[PDB]
Amino acid sequence: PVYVDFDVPADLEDDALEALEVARDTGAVKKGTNETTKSIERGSAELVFVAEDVQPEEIVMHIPELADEKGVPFIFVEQQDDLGHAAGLEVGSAAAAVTDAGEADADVEDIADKVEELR
Template sequence: MSVYVTTDIPADLAEDALEALEVARDTGRVKKGTNETTKAIERGNADLVYVAEDVSPEEIVMHIPELADEKGIPVVFIETQDDVGHAAGLEVGSAAAAIVDAGEASGDVEDIAGKVEDLD
């Protein structure tokens, strides 16, 4: 487990979170990549943040969990960058993503956020 991974996310919850990201991508708004995700967190626009566990060097995303925690935004740690990128609609991996407008996934996002907060 990487240094920045603060919570061990169960596989079924991670899968549900990726499905919610896909729905939000199609019906809402999603920010992709470390920079866009960081901006969404800083502005308080993110509803749910995704961070890949296989980022190297780790310093690229190390600030995201702490920043999200300060803003009260739940973070889901996903096993690979490819999983995050593909769920966000990219053909390549992404170190991070954020749901800004959940669209039709709003109920799922609220449920996932609650479960992630309960894990802490």
């Protein structure tokens, strides 16, 4: 909420998670706020997801700005356990990063575009 500056439509969120699910089966994806954070820093990240029900919020407050000053696109998910499920985890995940998609590149691209438009 303090780090969220725009609302993502339930639909867009749908496509992204699906794209993320195919990304783990095809390309490469990072699971966890630490790994997600390094990807953005190492630049090896194309799309980073960030749950919105993270408490305490400090765990993710940094993602947004760190991503901006790295051109890396990011998107918010409402639930924490969905991102974890979609990431292929048996647990939740505060953040995630698609480290080079796979047969989803087209989709990931659009999502990033759709977001920038959503300001």
